[PDB]
């Protein structure tokens, strides 16, 4: 296990040291996105929540292909605004219901320490 708590003030700092191996040790889902919504990293906890296979969704667009239920002003709109502004830090509850049993989650989106990368963090509620 990688002891990092969900919602940690300095989470972008802590996770800049991890490779996909270490990311898989998190107590929660973590997705890394580029500015366009493309998946750069997808960890095993997220796979456990959504039933997706990590390696199969890497390189796919999250809002277009993988998760259309987040293609909405309540999710994707917050993301596109963060990317445009170059700052992002927001936490909100959401239901994931695409090709899966509807599953209520807590989502935290935050800009990574690195230029054009963005984190999506997910835990069950
Ligand atoms: C809604 O679009 C629910 C599905 C879903 C699939 C994968 C990930 O990572 C998040 C949400």
Curated annotation (Swiss-Prot):
GO terms for biological process: phototransduction; regulation of DNA-templated transcription. InterPro entries: PAS, PAS-like_dom_sf, PAS_fold, PYP. Keywords: Chromophore, Photoreceptor protein, Receptor, Sensory transduction. Coiled coil: none annotated. Residues 23-86 form the PAS domain. The modification S-(4-hydroxycinnamyl)cysteine is found at residue 69. One of its GO terms (molecular function) is photoreceptor activity. The 4-hydroxycinnamic acid (p-coumaric acid) chromophore is covalently bound via a thioester linkage. Monomer. Belongs to the photoactive yellow protein family. Photoactive blue light protein. Probably functions as a photoreceptor for a negative phototaxis response. This is Photoactive yellow protein. It comes from Halorhodospira halophila (Ectothiorhodospira halophila). The lineage of its organism: Bacteria, Pseudomonadati, Pseudomonadota, Gammaproteobacteria, Chromatiales. The gene is pyp.
